[PDB]
């Protein structure tokens, strides 16, 4: 069940509680959404890598709950319950992002995980639903 | 003929069409304005072959013999 153009065209489309598309092993063929969504819900799928996106200027929210994200190739990124294991794997997020959630990922239990994210991704204001504070 | 316009555009052009609203089809079109972010002084004008025009824009049309 490839993420295909045909798949995207029959997918529930609605205004959420922003314009959101309701959605797989590999993220691909996003061209067909035509950059018309503010949010894309990819929860409960089997994606391994957050990669493969076309240029999408609209896209501001990515809900990627319960997948198998182990590597990273936009204002809000929800990655709860995935497979990121090393602090260094979170490095690509420095190039984006204000709301970040990485809970229920092995990486969470690494020593200094919170401080590492804060220094390497300073643009984040809320991390794991807690305010990044000055101290 | 020359036309003055709401947006500071002196339209020197050849008239083709005319109506109640003073909309105009224009040939041999030569507009005159000034792209200028202050203090600056530039005088610019461009040729256009064929051009439709809307009437609310028109302030005063004039004819130079």
């Amino acid at each position: 069940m490839k993420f295909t153009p045909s798949i995207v065209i029959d997918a529930p489309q609605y205004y959420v509680d922003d314009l959101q598309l309701e959605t797989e092993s590999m993220p691909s063929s996003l061209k067909h959404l035509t950059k018309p969504t503010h949010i894309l819900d990819l929860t409960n799928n089997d994606l391994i890598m957050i990669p493969d996106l076309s240029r999408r200027d609209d896209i501001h929210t990515l809900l990627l709950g319960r997948n198998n994200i182990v590597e990273v190739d936009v204002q809000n990124l929800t990655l709860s319950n995935n497979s990121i294991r090393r602090f260094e794997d979170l490095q690509r997020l420095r190039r984006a992002l204000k709301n970040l959630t990485l809970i229920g990922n092995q990486v969470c239990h690494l020593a200094n995980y919170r401080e590492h994210v804060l220094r390497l991704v300073p643009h984040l204001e809320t991390l794991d639903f807690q305010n990044v504070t000055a101290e | 003929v020359i036309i003055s316009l709401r947006n500071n555009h002196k339209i020197i052009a050849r008239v083709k069409a005319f109506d109640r609203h003073c909309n105009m089809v224009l040939e041999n079109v030569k507009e005159l304005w000034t792209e200028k972010k202050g203090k600056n002084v530039i005088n610019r004008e461009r040729f256009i072959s064929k051009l439709f025009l809307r009437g609310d824009s028109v302030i005063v049309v004039l004819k130079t013999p």
Binding site: - | E27, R46, F47
Partner: protein, 53 residues
Amino acid sequence: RARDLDLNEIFTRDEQYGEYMELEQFHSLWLNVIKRGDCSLLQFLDILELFLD
């Protein structure tokens, strides 16, 4: 191999995949260049012909 190959992204409609070349645009720019309107599309093409010699 080339499933996402599309000619319409290379040729405009007025070119008809190499049948014609769209020179109207350049006739416009040309009018802008000569600072008048005495020049018609056909007289412009007549000008271009010079470059065949």
